Amino acid sequence: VLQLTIGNSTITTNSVVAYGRWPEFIQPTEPDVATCRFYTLDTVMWGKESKGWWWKLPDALRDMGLFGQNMYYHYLGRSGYTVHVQCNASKFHQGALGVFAIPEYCLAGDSDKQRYTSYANANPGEKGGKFYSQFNRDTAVTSPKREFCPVDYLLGCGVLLGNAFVYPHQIINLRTNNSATIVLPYVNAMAIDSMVKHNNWGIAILPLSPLDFAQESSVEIPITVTIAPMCSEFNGLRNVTAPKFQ
Amino acid sequence: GLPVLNTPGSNQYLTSDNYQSPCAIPEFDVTPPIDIPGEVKNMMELAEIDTMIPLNLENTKRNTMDMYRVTLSDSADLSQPILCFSLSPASDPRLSHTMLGEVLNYYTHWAGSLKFTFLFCGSMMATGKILVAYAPPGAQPPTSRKEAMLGTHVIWDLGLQSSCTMVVPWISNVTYRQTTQDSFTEGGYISMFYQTRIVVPLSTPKSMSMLGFVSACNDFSVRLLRDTTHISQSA
Amino acid sequence: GLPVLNTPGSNQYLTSDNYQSPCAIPEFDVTPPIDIPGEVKNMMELAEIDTMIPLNLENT
Amino acid sequence: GLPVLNTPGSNQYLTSDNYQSPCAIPEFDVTPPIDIPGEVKNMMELAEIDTMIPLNLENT
Amino acid sequence: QRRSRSESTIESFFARGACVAIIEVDNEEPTQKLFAMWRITYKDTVQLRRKLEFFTYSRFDMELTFVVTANFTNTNNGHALNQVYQIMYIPPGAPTPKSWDDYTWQTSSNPSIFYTYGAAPARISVPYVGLANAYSHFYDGFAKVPLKTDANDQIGDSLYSAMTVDDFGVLAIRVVNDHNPTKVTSKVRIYMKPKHVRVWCPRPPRAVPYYGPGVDYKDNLNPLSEKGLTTY
Amino acid sequence: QRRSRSESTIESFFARGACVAIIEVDNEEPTQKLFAMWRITYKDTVQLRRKLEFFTYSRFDMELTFVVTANFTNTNNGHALNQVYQIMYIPPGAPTPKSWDDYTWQTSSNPSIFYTYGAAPARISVPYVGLANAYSHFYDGFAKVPLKTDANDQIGDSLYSAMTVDDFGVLAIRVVNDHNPTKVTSKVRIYMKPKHVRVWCPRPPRAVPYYGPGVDYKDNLNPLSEKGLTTY
Numbered sequence A: 001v002l003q004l005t006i007g008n009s010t011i012t013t014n015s016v017v018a019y020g021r022w023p024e025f026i027q028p029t030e031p032d033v034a035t036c037r038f039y040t041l042d043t044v045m046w047g048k049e050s051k052g053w054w055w056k057l058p059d060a061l062r063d064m065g066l067f068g069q070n071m072y073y074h075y076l077g078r079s080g081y082t083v084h085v086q087c088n089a090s091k092f093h094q095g096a097l098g099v100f101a102i103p104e105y106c107l108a109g110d111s112d113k114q115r116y117t118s119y120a121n122a123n124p125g126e127k128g129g130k131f132y133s134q135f136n137r138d139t140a141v142t143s144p145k146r147e148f149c150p151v152d153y154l155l156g157c158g159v160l161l162g163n164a165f166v167y168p169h170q171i172i173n174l175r176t177n178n179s180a181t182i183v184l185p186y187v188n189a190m191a192i193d194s195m196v197k198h199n200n201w202g203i204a205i206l207p208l209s210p211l212d213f214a215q216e217s218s219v220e221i222p223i224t225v226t227i228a229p230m231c232s233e234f235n236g237l238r239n240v241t242a243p244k245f246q
Numbered sequence B: 001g002l003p004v005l006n007t008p009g010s011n012q013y014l015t016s017d018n019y020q021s022p023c024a025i026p027e028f029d030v031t032p033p034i035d036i037p038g039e040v041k042n043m044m045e046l047a048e049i050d051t052m053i054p055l056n057l058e059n060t061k062r063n064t065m066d067m068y069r070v071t072l073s074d075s076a077d078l079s080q081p082i083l084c085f086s087l088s089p090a091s092d093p094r095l096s097h098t099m100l101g102e103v104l105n106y107y108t109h110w111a112g113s114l115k116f117t118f119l120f121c122g123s124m125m126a127t128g129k130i131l132v133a134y135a136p137p138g139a140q141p142p143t144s145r146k147e148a149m150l151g152t153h154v155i156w157d158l159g160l161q162s163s164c165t166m167v168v169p170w171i172s173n174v175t176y177r178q179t180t181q182d183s184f185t186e187g188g189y190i191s192m193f194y195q196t197r198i199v200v201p202l203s204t205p206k207s208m209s210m211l212g213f214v215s216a217c218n219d220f221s222v223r224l225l226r227d228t229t230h231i232s233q234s235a
Numbered sequence C, D: 001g002l003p004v005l006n007t008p009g010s011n012q013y014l015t016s017d018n019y020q021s022p023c024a025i026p027e028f029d030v031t032p033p034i035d036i037p038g039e040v041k042n043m044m045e046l047a048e049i050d051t052m053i054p055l056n057l058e059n060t
Numbered sequence E, F: 001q002r003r004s005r006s007e008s009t010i011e012s013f014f015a016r017g018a019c020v021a022i023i024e025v026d027n028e029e030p031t032q033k034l035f036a037m038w039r040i041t042y043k044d045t046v047q048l049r050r051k052l053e054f055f056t057y058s059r060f061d062m063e064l065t066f067v068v069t070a071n072f073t074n075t076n077n078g079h080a081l082n083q084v085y086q087i088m089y090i091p092p093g094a095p096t097p098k099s100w101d102d103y104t105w106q107t108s109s110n111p112s113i114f115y116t117y118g119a120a121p122a123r124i125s126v127p128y129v130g131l132a133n134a135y136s137h138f139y140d141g142f143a144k145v146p147l148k149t150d151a152n153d154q155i156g157d158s159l160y161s162a163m164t165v166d167d168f169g170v171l172a173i174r175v176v177n178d179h180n181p182t183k184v185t186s187k188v189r190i191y192m193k194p195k196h197v198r199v200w201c202p203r204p205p206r207a208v209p210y211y212g213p214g215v216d217y218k219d220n221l222n223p224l225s226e227k228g229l230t231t232y
């Protein structure tokens, strides 16, 4: 059994390295301990009719630990991630979770106006978001929601979810593995970029096969996403950034 | 000065050419490249990546999540195949839109051994044997397991391994098949049958789904770049 | 740049010429040739083959 | 003479180019340069010079 | 012996560029001749065909030269600026244009030429794009086989001596200029010069006029003329 | 194995020049089409876009080729001498022209082409002019961040997946010839051939028609067609 320990956080179990590149550094400010903890996101229930979940990195780790504090205080920071998606399932639970790590995971909005989604709805953080079977158009012209309308089979970006495996992916197949680990290096056009506005990665937990258990009516098991910022180094220390999330 | 002779083909613009051109912005200090992960040096490197196949394409399951997973069960008939599709990675509706097929639609000729990784998404207590058979063309499609086991085939135990790699070797009369659907360069027929039905104990979902991922091998290559039929632009 | 002089015969197309031309499909991995029997390297090789003559050519 | 092929972009004038051109006044004995002070070899040498900023920009 | 076989070589025998097609392209109003897609093949003309049917298999780096000749039609006093003709390749599978103002003319991956009228004819070389190891001038088979288990006879019904329906795609020629009231009818003549020709399994040439893209023949089956048996 | 990957290379995959824009420029009288400023981007056409959206980041030395096709409009018998088209670059910040007879057309530091109609299409190479170390086909962020201390929501309101408003400036095309009574409507088609292409972080291509310059989509969300589960 694999037991990976980083900083002051240990996770017991296969792990895959995104694009075969390990997170490594490039005077940046690198907390070797305060930012290497495996911050645990909000656990999400995998309902029988669930369509999927999506988080934005490092947006997900904006309020957890000192990583978010260094991210808001500093101007521009680069950080690799280690995403451990653990789904406790019994021998009689069937299902598969595609854990995709989309670089620059641009999602589609609900309104007819292109790229009209707001910053608050595009950066939900630890909460994340969820996919939808169809594309429900925003009809509130007086007060547009300005939120994503991610579609499962379209991956929220118009591409096919079947081809989404071009990204760094890992399949949590409850019959063979109850957890998955993806080590994402800092992927960006720039050597280092502002994290408060830019989301380096996007994690998508999509049920490739529906969850069933003993022919039960409704079955829901927990899914815990634990993200660890690896080699997170920031630069441009200045006054704290307090974004408007409404 | 030097006596020259304008040959036929002058003052034309061939979109596919490597002629030099004046730099519009000379002495331009470009941004130095950094070591960005995931560098792609060839398009086939994307085809080698196994990507899930829209196997099921019924009128009610296509263009949804149901199209990627194929439902197999113990109640399912063993005489009838699980799934079947021609080995047309660029013109078959199931393989055409896969990343492999997406890259092939930009080329006219393709030649290589394919790779179909079928992943089982049933319970760990669910066991069974699936016969995955590739039958080269030129004969009746394998409508039965007795006909499918005559060609290339592999038995996949659902209990031992959750994913089976059915490698389709490159067998063809022509050195390169066409990406369109045509009977001369047709690829073959991939089918799945129940060698032994799925056996599930009590308190176990009798009907389970599975996934299929198509990929290209190292020997896979393409040529005669072209425009994909997928994308369109109303004008 | 280099001063050139367009000689007579420019911008013409002589069907019998060996001028170069841009490859319409560059970096094209052609199919490697195999040893097919009966390779003809010259047209006269076909003339050397004895072929029956329509000697009789009456109207019937 | 030499068979040439006019590539796309011929008979155009791109303002940003380094093509040669016929000297309109050939064999012209230009005036030899002298060591004039303050030679600028790069535009950024002018940016490096600290110049006062119009900080205050009120309407008055 | 002492006389060289230079002019008789296969490279020299096909060194001439042969008109393989004449494509009529108009800039008329939307009243179908706006563009034209010609299936690339030498069998539209009989001369280069017969030169190629001399052999069973061929492998040559083709060289296509487009000579565009335009005229004013339905107008005695007609005006129009110098037209630019787009000759786009649509290999088997690439989306074919359904109209003049179609997206496929963008040529994002389809190779295309933009020939300015009055300039030198548009020449381009094409390597051996054959699927097999040699071009099959003659095919003694089919593309499908009608099996006993076929639901109907049309499932396996294929054309004899026809390998692929879309042999090598279509050449789509249009006038890039907008549709002007003055109709300019243009004829693009495509001349095919096989280069680096390697031929295999020679065949006697067709003595009767061609009939279609196969070896069929309908009439004019009298190649030899009347001549005495003992008349020199 | 033995078959080469030459045609599959990234340099070969983008070796084709793709129409990225069609600019309509007229020489009409001052009655707005005298000149036209097109924001330089490949997202006006979907083919080259989709080819680029195959990857997240790119670094390529572009090659733009302008094919100008002119016609006589509103005149059956129209005359005009050979026109010269000025294609001027206006990078982000350079003053844009407000009229045809504007000073900015002097091109003292803006690179510009003067293409004589009927000549070879105007080709020019452009290096990687990206600010970052690679072009960002996809951006999962914004340009501004709405802060708690902002006076209003529009201070930090920015478009999603939009880095800069003036991405890479505008291409301003005009007819250098004086406005003649005979109106000559011209279409300048810009063809983009990425050279020295280096791509990073591949992405699956868009299976649904594009909708705007982002990854949004409105209709035609049915890429796959109906097909039996066990039908070959």
Ligand SMILES: CCCCCCCCCCCCC/C=C/[C@H](O)[C@H](N)CO
Binding pocket: C024, E040, E041, E042, E062, E064, E087, E088, E089, E111, E112, E113, E124, E126, E129, E135, E136, E137, E167, E168, E171
């Ligand atoms: C402006 C771009 C035009 C590109 C033109 C290249 C098209 C390549 C097709 C050439 C193939 C013709 C030679 C092959 C002939 C075949 O053997 C016969 N049709 C019978 O098999």
Ligand SMILES: CCCCCCCCCCCCC/C=C/[C@H](O)[C@H](N)CO
Binding pocket: B024, F040, F041, F042, F062, F064, F087, F088, F089, F111, F112, F113, F124, F126, F129, F135, F136, F137, F167, F168, F171
């Ligand atoms: C006649 C002078 C014309 C000079 C033309 C040079 C303009 C340079 C702009 C080329 C940049 C286009 C390639 C970049 C594409 C971007 O990545 C996408 N718009 C999204 O980021």
